[PDB]
DNA sequence: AGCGTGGGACC
DNA sequence: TGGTCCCACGC
């Protein structure tokens, strides 16, 4: 992998760019994202999606088993080998 | 079940 | 840069 942490004694190197720049902001501790609703700060904004989900319960992810609906891909995809 | 949160890969 | 899905781990 091509990009490094250079933070110290930090080994992780990653393979895109973009996701060292998102690894960077744990250590800095930065959370460019805020949640209009509950005014929680969050590091990313795919994580920012899907927490405002929480308070709208919006739920765009249904099994296609039972048809039960998830705020999240995850949640459907940990919900349907239950079927099995 | 619910959901914060990190990683791969992508656009 | 700035996000934007898919997916796994943790409690
Ligand atoms: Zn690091
Ligand atoms: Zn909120
Ligand atoms: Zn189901």
Same mark, same amino acid.
């Given at each position: 992998?091509?990009?490094?942490?250079?933070?110290?004694?930090?080994?992780?190197?990653?393979?895109?760019?973009?996701?060292?720049?998102?690894? #960077? *902001?744990?250590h =800095? +501790?930065? &959370?460019?994202?805020?949640?209009? %609703? !509950?005014?929680?700060? /969050?590091?990313? @904004? $795919?994580?920012?999606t899907?927490? #405002? *989900?929480?308070? =709208? +319960?919006? &739920?765009?992810?249904?099994?296609? %088993? !039972?048809?039960?609906? /998830?705020?999240? @891909? $995850?949640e459907?995809?940990?919900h349907?080998?239950?079927?099995?």
């Amino acid at each position: 992998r091509p990009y490094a942490c250079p933070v110290e004694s930090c080994d992780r190197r990653f393979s895109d760019s973009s996701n060292l720049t998102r690894h #960077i *902001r744990i250590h =800095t +501790g930065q &959370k460019p994202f805020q949640c209009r %609703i !509950c005014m929680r700060n /969050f590091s990313r @904004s $795919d994580h920012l999606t899907t927490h #405002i *989900r929480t308070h =709208t +319960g919006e &739920k765009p992810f249904a099994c296609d %088993i !039972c048809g039960r609906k /998830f705020a999240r @891909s $995850d949640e459907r995809k940990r919900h349907t080998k239950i079927h099995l």
